[PDB]
Amino acid sequence: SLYRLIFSSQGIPNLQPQDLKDILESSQRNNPANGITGLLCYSKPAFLQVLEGECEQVNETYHRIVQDERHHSPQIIECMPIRRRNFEVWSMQAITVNDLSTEQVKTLVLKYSGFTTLRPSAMDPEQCLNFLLDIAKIYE
Amino acid sequence: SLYRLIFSSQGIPNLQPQDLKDILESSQRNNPANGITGLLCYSKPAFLQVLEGECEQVNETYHRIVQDERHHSPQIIECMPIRRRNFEVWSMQAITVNDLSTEQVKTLVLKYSGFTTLRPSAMDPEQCLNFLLDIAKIYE
Ligand SMILES: Cc1cc2nc3c(=O)[nH]c(=O)nc-3n(C[C@H](O)[C@H](O)[C@H](O)COP(=O)(O)O)c2cc1C
Ligand SMILES: Cc1cc2nc3c(=O)[nH]c(=O)nc-3n(C[C@H](O)[C@H](O)[C@H](O)COP(=O)(O)O)c2cc1C
Fold first, then answer.
1. What are the b/e assignments for B7-39, b being 16+ CB within 10 Å?
2. Where does FMN 1 bind (chains A, B) (predicted)?
3. CA-based, 20 to 30 A from A72: which of A66, B37, B62, B114?
């Protein structure tokens, strides 16, 4: 009943600043409640993110996520029953990747991937989550 | 880059043999090119799909299956990269299970479940793997 879901996506080519905080209000009004927790990451245009919570919640959310007019082509990287939550999960939070490339952050991309750019496309699930973890560290 | 995805959904109140013949002619047609192979399985109401391939046309197919309406509310029990394929024989293989099924199949259902009717959300990843495994193991 306690799952972890990983997957990445592609943000519609015309997405604006005022759209993402609206993705936030959502994640911060729709998750805490659901014992949905974890971390969402943006690197124009690449998306990554892990979900953790009740299996049925994890799912209730992901499939609700997929129809959003705001991006296309989502790749589940992992969905698996887990032993314990990793993010103490103050919230399903969001980080924009700058890109801004870089100050100690580009490094985190030769490490878990190759080039300086966020291609969740090279990542294996472990290098996938390993990364979502390392970034949050140096950040609150 | 290989990956395996296992999921189960709820059929609509009225799927007929005619309505079951239609999901398959679409996966021995699409999936061959699509590169999709696996067992599907159907004990009214639920289907219980296993799908095998690389990460892209997996999601491609699934997210498409979920766009389907013949069922509703899919759930991912497990997605992640594998060693080797287990369902390579059929580009898909439908297999109806029902209380009318042979007294044999009825008991393979019981070997992994707490009740005699196929119930996915009460079965862990291993249980479904082997069920589907042992159940294709015995279907030409
Ligand atoms: C990358 C991305 C991640 C999102 N994550 C969530 C989420 O975790 N929870 C959520 O409720 N909405 C999330 N959304 C937004 C939903 O698609 C949608 O806005 C939300 O379900 C609407 O909720 P509302 O009924 O409160 O307005 C996300 C959107 C994007 C683009
Ligand atoms: C439970 C279930 C599983 C399905 N699995 C597949 C599948 O593996 N591959 C596929 O192409 N269609 C699958 N479908 C049906 C697709 O939603 C749809 O029939 C297909 O994308 C249409 O293909 P067509 O345009 O060639 O007719 C499934 C449908 C259901 C209800």
1. bbbebeeebeeeebeebbeebeebbeebbbbbb
2. 26, 29-31, 49, 64, 68, 70
3. B37
